[PDB]
Design a protein around this ligand. Structure first.
Ligand SMILES: [Ca+2]
Ligand SMILES: [Ca+2]
Ligand SMILES: [Ca+2]
Ligand SMILES: [Zn+2]
Ligand SMILES: [Zn+2]
Lengths: 92, 158
């Protein structure tokens, strides 16, 4: 895995929205928890192909997640992980 | 986790949602801060000029803080824990339809939840708690902080 920290688990076929964090200058995939006020998981891929580096791009993805190492300002309810993408495809 | 080191906390409403009358937004926000001030030694004052401790913003999509809203659906708001600058600020997704009661997202209940985060609370594992992650509508007259919410906020502020 491209992630520094040990693999926690594998995530399979999650649906998220791609965006860029200007603070750490890194792309991430955002997955919100339906029906919650503010539960969001950010997945920071260390192997994202430039083809998917587009704002608000919707993807279906799978990969190995690890604890994030990034010094990032997160709102409450938002957690972040590092991800080694195994599959990623544009949707709609 | 960080807490406000002072008990006199100011908030400012940066802008208003067009979904609700300005007085209804004011009321919901004032009553949401009142929920928390009733069980802690914290005092909240609304200011209209200068830098407030807690800035209340209504915005859609990307709005300058690296945590873009997601349009209609998904999450409803987000807030930052105590600290300077963005710390304490509560942002509400303008792509949501904010309401005084139900038939949309209830601003009062969402503000109670977000202000709990502004004050340093995380989520609760008690389904009755306002800090429980799931959006649950209850009428403002019936609404009460759960014992878990009270224990959580008093653990931080007394
Ligand atoms: Ca602030
Ligand atoms: Ca939304
Ligand atoms: Ca709206
Ligand atoms: Zn929350
Ligand atoms: Zn925001």
């Amino acid at each position: 895995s491209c992630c520094d920290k040990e693999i926690i688990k594998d995530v399979s076929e999650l649906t998220g929205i791609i965006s860029y964090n200007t603070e750490v200058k890194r792309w991430y995939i955002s997955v919100s928890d339906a029906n919650s006020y503010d539960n969001v998981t950010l997945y920071f891929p260390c192997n994202l192909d430039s083809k998917y580096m587009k704002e608000k791009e919707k993807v279906i993805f799978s990969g190995q997640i690890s604890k994030s190492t990034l010094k990032i300002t997160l709102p409450a309810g938002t957690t972040s992980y590092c991800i080694n993408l195994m599959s990623i495809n544009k949707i709609n | 986790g960080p807490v406000w080191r002072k008990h006199y906390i100011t908030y400012r409403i940066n802008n208003y949602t067009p979904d609700m009358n300005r007085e209804d937004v004011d009321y919901a926000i004032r009553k949401a801060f009142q929920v928390w001030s009733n069980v802690t030694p914290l005092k909240f004052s609304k200011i209209n000029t200068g830098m407030a401790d807690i800035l209340v913003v209504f915005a859609r999509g990307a709005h300058g803080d690296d945590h873009a809203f997601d349009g209609k659906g998904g999450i409803l708001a987000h807030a930052f824990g105590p600290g300077s600058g963005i710390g304490g600020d509560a942002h509400f997704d303008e792509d949501e339809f904010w309401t005084t009661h139900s038939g949309g997202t209830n601003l009062f209940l969402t503000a109670v939840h977000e202000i709990g985060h502004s004050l340093g609370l995380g989520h609760s594992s008690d389904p009755k708690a306002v800090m429980f992650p799931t959006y649950k509508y209850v009428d403002i007259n019936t609404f009460r902080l759960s014992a878990d919410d009270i224990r959580g906020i008093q653990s931080l502020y007394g």
